[PDB]
Amino acid sequence: SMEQVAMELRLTELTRLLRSVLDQLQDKDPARIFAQPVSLKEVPDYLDHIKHPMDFATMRKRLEAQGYKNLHEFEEDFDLIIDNCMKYNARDTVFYRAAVRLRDQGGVVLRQARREVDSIG
Incomplete structure (x- = not known):
């Protein structure tokens, strides 16, 4: 249907905007501390502590599959x-300390992303 196409085009456009957001957030991590998944070979107890690991590579994979339906996700x-x-x-x-600095610097980027997402629809 044409309605399905239009919804697909909106997802594509969101994906473009989220890629630009992701790039801007990852620039705030110049040490590349958050670039890749915590290695279970190097931190073998990690999943006993952290139930839902996350990193920028993993987000990038999700994004490129158009796997974020909205900015909240x-x-x-x-x-x-x-x-x-x-x-x-x-x-x-x-x-x-890197996490604190990424949080603080990323808040600025996310504040304007929310306005863009709402504005463009």
Whole structure:
């Protein structure tokens, strides 16, 4: 149907906008701390601590399959990156501190993304 096509075009357009958002957020992680999944070979107890691991590579795979239906879903995954790190790592670590800086800098990007998503529909 034409209605299904139109809904598909909207998903494609959201996907484009979320790719630009993802790029902007990942620039706020210049150390690449959050670029890839925590390795279970290197942190073998990780899944005893963290129930829903997340990272930028994993988000990028989901995005390229058009797997985010709305900005809320995308933000959920971004917040898991931050929130997982702030539980597993202590305050005095480079990991925790990187998460805080990514959260603070990313809030700005997400604030305007929400306006764009709402505005364009």
